[PDB]
Amino acid sequence: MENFQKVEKIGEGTYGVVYKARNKLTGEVVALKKIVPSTAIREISLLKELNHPNIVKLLDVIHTENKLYLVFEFLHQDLKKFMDASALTGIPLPLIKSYLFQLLQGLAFCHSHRVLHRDLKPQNLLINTEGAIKLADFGLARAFGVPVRTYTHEVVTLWYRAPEILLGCKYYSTAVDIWSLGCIFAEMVTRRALFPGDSEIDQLFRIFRTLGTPDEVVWPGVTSMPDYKPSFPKWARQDFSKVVPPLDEDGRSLLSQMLHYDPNKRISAKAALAHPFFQDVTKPVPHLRL
Numbered sequence: 001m002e003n004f005q006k007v008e009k010i011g012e013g014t015y016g017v018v019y020k021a022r023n024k025l026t027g028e029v030v031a032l033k034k035i036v037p038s039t040a041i042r043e044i045s046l047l048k049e050l051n052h053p054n055i056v057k058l059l060d061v062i063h064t065e066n067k068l069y070l071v072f073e074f075l076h077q078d079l080k081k082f083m084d085a086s087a088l089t090g091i092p093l094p095l096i097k098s099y100l101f102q103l104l105q106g107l108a109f110c111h112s113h114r115v116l117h118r119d120l121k122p123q124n125l126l127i128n129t130e131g132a133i134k135l136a137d138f139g140l141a142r143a144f145g146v147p148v149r150t151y152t153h154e155v156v157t158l159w160y161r162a163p164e165i166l167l168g169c170k171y172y173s174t175a176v177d178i179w180s181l182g183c184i185f186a187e188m189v190t191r192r193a194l195f196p197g198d199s200e201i202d203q204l205f206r207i208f209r210t211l212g213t214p215d216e217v218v219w220p221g222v223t224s225m226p227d228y229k230p231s232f233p234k235w236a237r238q239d240f241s242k243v244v245p246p247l248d249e250d251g252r253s254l255l256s257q258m259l260h261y262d263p264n265k266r267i268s269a270k271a272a273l274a275h276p277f278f279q280d281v282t283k284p285v286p287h288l289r290l
């Protein structure tokens with residue numbers, strides 16, 4: 001750690017403080033994350049090779065005196081701040097589309113290596129002045145787990161959590177990231193979180209109020225999952241035209257596929273990239289005030 005000068009705290013992450021820092025040597029500006037069982041070290045070490053333009057680069061791992069630090073490529077802003085700033089007029093559809101397209105490429109690459117994110121949210125989707133967006137903290141959930149509360153006791157949000165996780169599936173898949181990204185897509189479009197649950201049941205019931213209570217017809221095997229209760233209320237599914245106006249039919253079609261209940265049938269990142277919604281994708285440059 002003597003090789004880095006902390007510049008400022010840029011966030012309180014799931015696992016510890018996140019700092020902007022400078023490599024006293026090279027002068028490189030990085031993000032430094034404070035987080036060790038050998039299994040966790042091996043998993044993190046493998047992430048050093050999971051390189052892609054839409055994945056925040058893991059530069060190095062420092063483990064000294066039993067304290068662990070991850071060193072990442074630095075990006076200047078997150079999607080949460082950008083959405084808050086763009087709220088009066090909303091993020092233009094071409095930019096939402098470019099961001100969704102890029103995020104799907106990051107997911108497709110990681111998922112091809114069977115690496116999950118598991119905790120996508122606006123706070124870990126990072127943007128630069130060039131119109132790129134990148135996913136931060138990919139693979140960390142498998143290495144360290146996803147706790148109920150962060151190191152600062154902050155509640156880890158449930159808003160983007162896939163229903164199979166909430167229903168107690170032990171061996172959930174890459175589909176959980178597609179669900180989270182669908183929730184984020186809806187939020188960019190409407191300027192409001194889609195499912196802002198404040199407990200596991202409120203999260204689950206919010207999903208059900210919009211998408212309908214799942215049953216054996218739409219999700220074969222759902223009634224067998226650990227946390228499924230036959231006493232869940234039965235809500236009817238809402239039309240997406242009500243849920244995400246004024247998104248066009250291509251976007252609604254893709255969203256509906258990203259929010260399928262049955263994880264085996266939820267669209268993959270690779271298939272989503274081919275959806276007609278991306279026929280006219282471009283790469284606009286966002287207005288960033290840093």
Ligand SMILES: Fc1ccccc1-c1cc(NCc2ccncc2)n2nccc2n1
Pocket residue numbers: 010011012013014018020031056072073074075076077078123124125126136137
């Ligand atoms: F991914 C994260 C989760 C939670 C907290 C921070 C992060 C977080 C935030 C950033 N940069 C964005 C930024 C820059 C300056 N001020 C604020 C944010 N960065 N940059 C690389 C990793 C990272 N992780």
